[PDB]
Design a protein around this nucleic acid. Structure first.
Ligand SMILES: [Mg+2]
Ligand SMILES: [Mg+2]
Ligand SMILES: [Mg+2]
Ligand SMILES: [Mg+2]
Ligand SMILES: [Mg+2]
Ligand SMILES: [Mg+2]
Ligand SMILES: [Mg+2]
Ligand SMILES: [Mg+2]
Ligand SMILES: [Mg+2]
Ligand SMILES: [Mg+2]
Ligand SMILES: [Mg+2]
Length: 74
RNA sequence: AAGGGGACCAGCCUAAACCGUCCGGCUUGUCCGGGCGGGGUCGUGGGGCCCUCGGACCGAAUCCCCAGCCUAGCCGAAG
């Protein structure tokens, strides 16, 4: 069963990473402890959108700086 | 059972793509989800979306009116 981790987790994977676990583990541990979510299409979309949104605001800052290197350094 | 002879005869509505709107969620949007509306309905495959060209007839199984019909009757030849 594929899940999306909601947290870093000892020798399983890192937050936002998609891993394969035995359904028992997902259903009766990971999901109830809020540690992961089902890799459904409907929330794979959402993860894609989060990676999307973070990467927008990262490079947007790495411009607000780079462009501020232009106003200074000259 | 197919086929043949007959009876009767009639075909439609959706889901999904996509568009719009309301509402809810937290992991804040190019988000996910629920409702509603739009769109769509097919096997020569059909639809969606993006270009190009083109721009009144049919019509209910719903509704309304009516004929007809039922629920009482009546006239009815000549010792
Ligand atoms: Mg057989
Ligand atoms: Mg027959
Ligand atoms: Mg026949
Ligand atoms: Mg008959
Ligand atoms: Mg929805
Ligand atoms: Mg929506
Ligand atoms: Mg909706
Ligand atoms: Mg086609
Ligand atoms: Mg009809
Ligand atoms: Mg009499
Ligand atoms: Mg008499």
């Amino acid at each position: 069963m594929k899940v999306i981790l909601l947290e870093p987790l000892e020798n399983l994977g890192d937050v936002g990473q998609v891993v394969d676990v035995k359904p028992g583990y997902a259903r009766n541990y990971l999901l109830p402890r809020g540690l992961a979510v089902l890799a459904t299409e409907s929330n794979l979309k959402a993860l894609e959108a989060r990676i999307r949104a973070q990467a927008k605001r990262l490079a947007e800052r790495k411009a607000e700086a780079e462009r501020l290197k232009e106003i200074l350094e000259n």
